[PDB]
Amino acid sequence: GCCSNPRCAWRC
């Protein structure tokens, strides 16, 4: 996904 990467905390 993207929250699966710590650069995407804000939204997934």
Short mmCIF file of all heavy atoms in Angstrom, two decimals:
data_model
loop_
_atom_site.label_atom_id
_atom_site.label_comp_id
_atom_site.label_asym_id
_atom_site.label_seq_id
_atom_site.Cartn_x
_atom_site.Cartn_y
_atom_site.Cartn_z
N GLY A 1 0.84 -1.20 0.00
CA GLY A 1 0.00 0.00 0.00
C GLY A 1 0.87 1.24 0.00
O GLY A 1 1.77 1.36 -0.84
N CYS A 2 0.63 2.17 0.94
CA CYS A 2 1.52 3.30 1.17
C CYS A 2 1.78 3.49 2.66
O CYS A 2 2.93 3.72 3.02
CB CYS A 2 0.99 4.58 0.53
SG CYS A 2 2.24 5.89 0.40
N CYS A 3 0.79 3.33 3.54
CA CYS A 3 1.03 3.34 4.99
C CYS A 3 2.01 2.25 5.41
O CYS A 3 2.71 2.41 6.42
CB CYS A 3 -0.28 3.27 5.79
SG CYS A 3 -1.61 2.17 5.25
N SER A 4 2.17 1.22 4.58
CA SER A 4 3.17 0.17 4.66
C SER A 4 4.61 0.69 4.51
O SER A 4 5.55 -0.10 4.56
CB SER A 4 2.82 -0.83 3.54
OG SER A 4 2.55 -0.18 2.30
N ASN A 5 4.78 2.00 4.33
CA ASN A 5 6.04 2.70 4.17
C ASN A 5 6.01 3.94 5.06
O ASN A 5 5.05 4.71 4.97
CB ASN A 5 6.14 3.12 2.71
CG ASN A 5 7.50 3.70 2.42
OD1 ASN A 5 8.51 3.01 2.54
ND2 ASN A 5 7.55 4.96 2.04
N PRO A 6 7.03 4.21 5.89
CA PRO A 6 6.95 5.24 6.93
C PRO A 6 7.01 6.69 6.44
O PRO A 6 7.12 7.63 7.21
CB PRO A 6 8.07 4.89 7.92
CG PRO A 6 9.11 4.20 7.05
CD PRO A 6 8.27 3.46 6.00
N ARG A 7 6.88 6.87 5.13
CA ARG A 7 6.77 8.15 4.45
C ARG A 7 5.31 8.50 4.18
O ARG A 7 5.04 9.45 3.45
CB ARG A 7 7.61 8.08 3.16
CG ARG A 7 8.20 9.44 2.73
CD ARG A 7 8.84 9.35 1.34
NE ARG A 7 7.82 9.27 0.29
CZ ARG A 7 7.36 8.18 -0.34
NH1 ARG A 7 7.98 7.01 -0.23
NH2 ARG A 7 6.26 8.30 -1.07
N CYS A 8 4.34 7.73 4.69
CA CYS A 8 2.92 7.82 4.33
C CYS A 8 2.01 7.81 5.56
O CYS A 8 0.85 7.39 5.50
CB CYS A 8 2.57 6.70 3.33
SG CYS A 8 1.78 7.28 1.81
N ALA A 9 2.53 8.29 6.69
CA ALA A 9 1.83 8.32 7.97
C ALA A 9 0.46 8.99 7.87
O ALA A 9 -0.53 8.48 8.39
CB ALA A 9 2.72 8.99 9.01
N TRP A 10 0.39 10.09 7.12
CA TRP A 10 -0.74 10.98 7.04
C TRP A 10 -2.02 10.30 6.54
O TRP A 10 -3.10 10.63 7.03
CB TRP A 10 -0.33 12.10 6.08
CG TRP A 10 0.64 13.13 6.56
CD1 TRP A 10 1.45 13.03 7.63
CD2 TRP A 10 0.97 14.41 5.94
NE1 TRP A 10 2.27 14.14 7.71
CE2 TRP A 10 2.02 15.02 6.68
CE3 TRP A 10 0.53 15.09 4.78
CZ2 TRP A 10 2.62 16.23 6.28
CZ3 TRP A 10 1.13 16.29 4.37
CH2 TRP A 10 2.18 16.86 5.11
N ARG A 11 -1.93 9.38 5.58
CA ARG A 11 -3.10 8.89 4.86
C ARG A 11 -2.69 7.73 3.96
O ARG A 11 -1.55 7.67 3.50
CB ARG A 11 -3.72 10.02 3.99
CG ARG A 11 -2.77 10.67 2.96
CD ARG A 11 -3.50 11.75 2.15
NE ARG A 11 -3.06 13.12 2.47
CZ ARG A 11 -2.25 13.90 1.73
NH1 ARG A 11 -1.67 13.42 0.64
NH2 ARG A 11 -2.03 15.16 2.08
N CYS A 12 -3.63 6.83 3.70
CA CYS A 12 -3.36 5.57 3.03
C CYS A 12 -4.56 5.24 2.14
O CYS A 12 -5.59 5.92 2.19
CB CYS A 12 -3.13 4.52 4.12
SG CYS A 12 -2.33 3.01 3.54
#
